[PDB]
Amino acid sequence: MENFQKVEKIGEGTYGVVYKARNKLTGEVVALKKIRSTAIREISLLKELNHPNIVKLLDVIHLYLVFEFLHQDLKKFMDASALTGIPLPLIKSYLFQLLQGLAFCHSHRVLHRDLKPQNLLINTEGAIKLADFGLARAFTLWYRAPEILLGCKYYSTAVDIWSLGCIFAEMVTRRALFPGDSEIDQLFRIFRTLGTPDEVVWPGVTSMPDYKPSFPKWARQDFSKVVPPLDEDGRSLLSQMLHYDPNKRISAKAALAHPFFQDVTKPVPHLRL
Numbered sequence: 001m002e003n004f005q006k007v008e009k010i011g012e013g014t015y016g017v018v019y020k021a022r023n024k025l026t027g028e029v030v031a032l033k034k035i036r037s038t039a040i041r042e043i044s045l046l047k048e049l050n051h052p053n054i055v056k057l058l059d060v061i062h063l064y065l066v067f068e069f070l071h072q073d074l075k076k077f078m079d080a081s082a083l084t085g086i087p088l089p090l091i092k093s094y095l096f097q098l099l100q101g102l103a104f105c106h107s108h109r110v111l112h113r114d115l116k117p118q119n120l121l122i123n124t125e126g127a128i129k130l131a132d133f134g135l136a137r138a139f140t141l142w143y144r145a146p147e148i149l150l151g152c153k154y155y156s157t158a159v160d161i162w163s164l165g166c167i168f169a170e171m172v173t174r175r176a177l178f179p180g181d182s183e184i185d186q187l188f189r190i191f192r193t194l195g196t197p198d199e200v201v202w203p204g205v206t207s208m209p210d211y212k213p214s215f216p217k218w219a220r221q222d223f224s225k226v227v228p229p230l231d232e233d234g235r236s237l238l239s240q241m242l243h244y245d246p247n248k249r250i251s252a253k254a255a256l257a258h259p260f261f262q263d264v265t266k267p268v269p270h271l272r273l
């Protein structure tokens, strides 16, 4: 658009093509997202959701969304760190920061609903920020909470804690926890790991729209097997983020007080930009 000069195509997304652009009025570099009234209302409310761990929506040019620009996303970083693995102190700092952003948005009744590594942006200062926050409501299974896969219509902020659980496990193991090709394959990958849910562990699950009594019954695996060699604090946190039951699932604000974060620090990553 006339205020901007597109500098380079960054890539793509569920919403459209993403470009690095330069504001000609001010020389600021931004991310410009070309999208494919209640939507623009909703998208616009997102302008007021400012937190240091949420990528800032600067304006909405009715659609192009102009966002604050960051050089790298967590998927690129993990891919680069795949041989060696991200050091624990950094995983912990990132998790802590993402929990802060979530707790903020969740306090304002705003959910992401589509968290994935390509949506988590990182800088050289050690920050990590949530991109595309809110855009789903305003208008890749791998990070989807089981309530959504089972057809719940009124899912909650819990869904983002699940997604972040899955990411936390991926940073630690250097492998996606639940890499599904179908909703059913997504769900079976989950069940094969945490076991097939039932009323014991998830009260009301059997009433979910897509629940089937004929689901194969798998036994739960130990978390020490799922995220070796994460320590006890980390595993304990992770198990609470990955509870089937959305009401048992730890809140972002609760997670921040977990003892895994007792010695959280803010390391700086090794970025090649």
Ligand SMILES: NC(=O)[C@H]1C(=O)NC(=O)N(c2ccccc2)C1=O
Binding pocket: 010, 011, 012, 013, 018, 031, 055, 067, 068, 069, 070, 071, 072, 073, 118, 119, 121, 131, 132
């Ligand atoms: N602000 C953003 O949403 C973008 C950003 O600043 N930088 C960035 O690399 N991306 C991006 C991330 C992953 C794939 C394609 C583009 C953003 O979406």
